[PDB]
Design an enzyme around this catalytic site. Structure first.
Site, mmCIF file in Angstrom:
data_model
loop_
_atom_site.group_PDB
_atom_site.id
_atom_site.type_symbol
_atom_site.label_atom_id
_atom_site.label_comp_id
_atom_site.label_asym_id
_atom_site.label_seq_id
_atom_site.Cartn_x
_atom_site.Cartn_y
_atom_site.Cartn_z
ATOM 1 N N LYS A 15 0.659 -1.187 -0.027
ATOM 2 C CA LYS A 15 0.330 0.221 0.179
ATOM 3 C C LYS A 15 0.884 0.811 -0.078
ATOM 4 O O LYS A 15 1.785 1.601 0.535
ATOM 5 C CB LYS A 15 -1.046 0.030 1.048
ATOM 6 N N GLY A 16 0.942 2.223 -1.378
ATOM 7 C CA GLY A 16 1.890 3.278 -1.646
ATOM 8 C C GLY A 16 1.096 4.426 -1.192
ATOM 9 O O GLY A 16 -0.080 4.103 -0.227
ATOM 10 N N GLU A 20 -3.500 0.920 -4.202
ATOM 11 C CA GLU A 20 -3.364 -0.891 -3.600
ATOM 12 C C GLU A 20 -2.925 -1.646 -4.365
ATOM 13 O O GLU A 20 -2.855 -1.507 -5.881
ATOM 14 C CB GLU A 20 -4.588 -1.440 -2.309
ATOM 15 N N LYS A 36 -1.743 -3.346 -9.518
ATOM 16 C CA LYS A 36 -1.434 -2.054 -9.225
ATOM 17 C C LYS A 36 -3.025 -1.320 -8.624
ATOM 18 O O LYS A 36 -3.285 -0.909 -10.643
ATOM 19 C CB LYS A 36 -0.709 -1.455 -9.144
ATOM 20 N N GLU A 83 5.234 -6.790 -13.519
ATOM 21 C CA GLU A 83 6.053 -8.609 -12.506
ATOM 22 C C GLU A 83 5.607 -8.198 -10.942
ATOM 23 O O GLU A 83 5.986 -7.581 -10.770
ATOM 24 C CB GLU A 83 7.282 -8.567 -13.744
ATOM 25 N N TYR A 84 5.252 -9.657 -11.319
ATOM 26 C CA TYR A 84 5.860 -9.927 -9.466
ATOM 27 C C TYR A 84 6.328 -10.127 -9.008
ATOM 28 O O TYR A 84 7.296 -11.159 -9.547
ATOM 29 C CB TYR A 84 4.968 -11.427 -9.097
ATOM 30 N N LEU A 85 7.350 -9.648 -7.817
ATOM 31 C CA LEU A 85 8.387 -9.397 -7.405
ATOM 32 C C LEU A 85 8.735 -9.889 -6.055
ATOM 33 O O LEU A 85 8.082 -8.998 -5.253
ATOM 34 C CB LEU A 85 9.678 -8.455 -7.539
ATOM 35 N N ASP A 127 14.280 8.464 -8.765
ATOM 36 C CA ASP A 127 14.013 8.216 -7.071
ATOM 37 C C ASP A 127 14.657 7.057 -7.307
ATOM 38 O O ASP A 127 14.713 6.423 -6.528
ATOM 39 C CB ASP A 127 12.575 7.961 -7.850
HETATM 40 N N1 LIG Z 1 5.575 -5.225 -8.828
HETATM 41 C C1 LIG Z 1 5.759 -5.807 -7.187
HETATM 42 N N2 LIG Z 1 5.998 -6.889 -7.143
HETATM 43 C C2 LIG Z 1 5.993 -6.950 -5.399
HETATM 44 N N3 LIG Z 1 5.755 -6.259 -5.161
HETATM 45 C C3 LIG Z 1 5.687 -4.921 -5.053
HETATM 46 C C4 LIG Z 1 5.752 -4.257 -6.904
HETATM 47 N N4 LIG Z 1 5.469 -2.903 -7.479
HETATM 48 C C5 LIG Z 1 5.329 -3.188 -6.136
HETATM 49 N N5 LIG Z 1 5.629 -3.371 -4.949
HETATM 50 C C6 LIG Z 1 5.431 -2.590 -3.237
HETATM 51 O O1 LIG Z 1 4.204 -2.770 -2.753
HETATM 52 C C7 LIG Z 1 4.131 -1.315 -2.231
HETATM 53 C C8 LIG Z 1 3.237 -0.394 -3.154
HETATM 54 O O2 LIG Z 1 3.942 0.374 -3.861
HETATM 55 P P1 LIG Z 1 3.657 2.077 -4.821
HETATM 56 O O3 LIG Z 1 1.979 1.423 -5.026
HETATM 57 O O4 LIG Z 1 4.121 1.603 -6.179
HETATM 58 O O5 LIG Z 1 4.202 2.745 -3.308
HETATM 59 P P2 LIG Z 1 5.392 3.343 -3.435
HETATM 60 O O6 LIG Z 1 5.872 4.266 -4.480
HETATM 61 O O7 LIG Z 1 6.487 1.927 -3.178
HETATM 62 N N6 LIG Z 1 5.435 4.074 -2.046
HETATM 63 P P3 LIG Z 1 5.315 6.106 -1.954
HETATM 64 O O8 LIG Z 1 6.535 5.610 -3.093
HETATM 65 O O9 LIG Z 1 5.191 6.191 -0.653
HETATM 66 O O10 LIG Z 1 4.155 5.951 -2.696
HETATM 67 C C9 LIG Z 1 5.472 -1.480 -1.929
HETATM 68 O O11 LIG Z 1 5.659 -1.488 -0.884
HETATM 69 C C10 LIG Z 1 6.285 -1.664 -3.195
HETATM 70 O O12 LIG Z 1 7.617 -1.814 -3.047
HETATM 71 MG MG LIG Z 2 7.403 5.632 -4.427
#
Ligand SMILES: Nc1ncnc2c1ncn2[C@@H]1O[C@H](COP(=O)(O)OP(=O)(O)NP(=O)(O)O)[C@@H](O)[C@H]1O
Ligand SMILES: [Mg+2]
EC number: 2.7.11.1
Length: 281
Positions: A15-16, A20, A36, A83-85, A127
């Site tokens: 959750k960024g 979500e 996402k 891609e899922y990581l 970034d």
């Molecule tokens: N492709 C992916 N595979 C696995 N986890 C992911 C992937 N993309 C994002 N995540 C994780 O999911 C969460 C949400 O990512 P994201 O919505 O892009 O926000 P963020 O940039 O990591 N944080 P913020 O800068 O505060 O908005 C983070 O903890 C990421 O590391």
């Molecule tokens: Mg970010």
């Protein structure tokens, strides 16, 4: 194209700032994906940034950049398929304790291949930081989070936008001067420190304080029990004048990299350590 019909959500994995992220699977072909999902009404504020992220992502094709499998629209919700990581970010993997220099060098090498790819595509990440470096469960390393990435063109040979995460921002970016891909090389130097120490320089200070400190102060150095080539790698990146920084291509040949970098599959040790740690938290 109904992504509620094409994809199955298995678990919430992030959750960024907006939306979500879910661990999902393509109901056709059974490939596991990261999904996402963003409410475009709730994030109308960020639609320009969302558009840019997707654009840059669609234009990248590299084992070192998170793959993009398209976007789907369901009512007001945008579904961004990636891609899922599942290994965790490099920052996540720092949670249980410190990295050794073999791990640091391996991670930095892969980040460097990613940057060399992007920079050869005339893209600037802007970034770079350990939180935006994501690992697969089997240790493969990829650049993520392209929401503020910039594109150079034949005409636009420099960027000017104030963007990034302050602890990692290059002095020329902060002082919104004309900058290019070398800005990422500075950020890499800060990330190298972060990988070695667990946190960037000035981490305890207010972000606004850091914004005048970075242009003013001597550039950071890596002090303590680290090999001199690692300290030199950091120093090479953290030159306040961007034209004196090496390219990612040159840095791939740096002695700290050549001496200490190993196969990415060794990073499964780090990924297991994180899983062990997470289970007892
Ligand atoms: N492709 C992916 N595979 C696995 N986890 C992911 C992937 N993309 C994002 N995540 C994780 O999911 C969460 C949400 O990512 P994201 O919505 O892009 O926000 P963020 O940039 O990591 N944080 P913020 O800068 O505060 O908005 C983070 O903890 C990421 O590391
Ligand atoms: Mg970010």
């Amino acid at each position: 194209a109904d992504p509620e019909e094409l994809f199955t959500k298995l678990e919430k994995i992030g959750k960024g700032s907006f939306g979500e992220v879910f661990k999902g699977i393509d109901n056709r072909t059974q490939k596991v994906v990261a999904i996402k999902i963003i409410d475009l009404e709730e994030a109308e504020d960020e639609i320009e940034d969302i558009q840019q992220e997707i654009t840059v992502l669609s234009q990248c094709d590299s084992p070192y950049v998170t793959k993009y499998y398209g976007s789907y629209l369901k009512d007001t919700k945008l579904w961004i398929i990636m891609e899922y990581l599942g290994g965790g970010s490099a920052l996540d993997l720092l949670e249980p304790g410190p990295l050794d220099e073999t791990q640091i060098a391996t991670i930095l090498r892969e980040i460097l291949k990613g940057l060399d790819y992007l920079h050869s595509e005339k893209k600037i990440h802007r970034d770079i930081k350990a939180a935006n470096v994501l690992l697969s469960e089997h240790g493969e390393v990829k650049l993520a989070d392209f929401g503020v990435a910039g594109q150079l063109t034949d005409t636009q040979i420099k960027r000017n936008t104030f963007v990034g995460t302050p602890f990692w921002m290059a002095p020329e970016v902060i002082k919104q001067s004309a900058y290019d891909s070398k800005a990422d090389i500075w950020s890499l130097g800060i990330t190298a420190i972060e990988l070695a120490r667990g946190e960037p320089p000035h981490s305890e200070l207010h972000p606004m304080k850091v914004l005048f400190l970075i242009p003013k102060n001597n550039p950071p150095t890596l002090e303590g029990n680290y090999s001199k080539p690692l300290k030199e790698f950091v120093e090479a990146c953290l030159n306040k004048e961007p034209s004196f920084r090496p390219t990612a291509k040159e840095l791939l040949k740096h002695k700290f990299i050549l001496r200490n970098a190993k196969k990415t599959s060794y990073l499964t040790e780090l990924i297991d350590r994180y899983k062990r740690w997470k289970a007892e938290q």
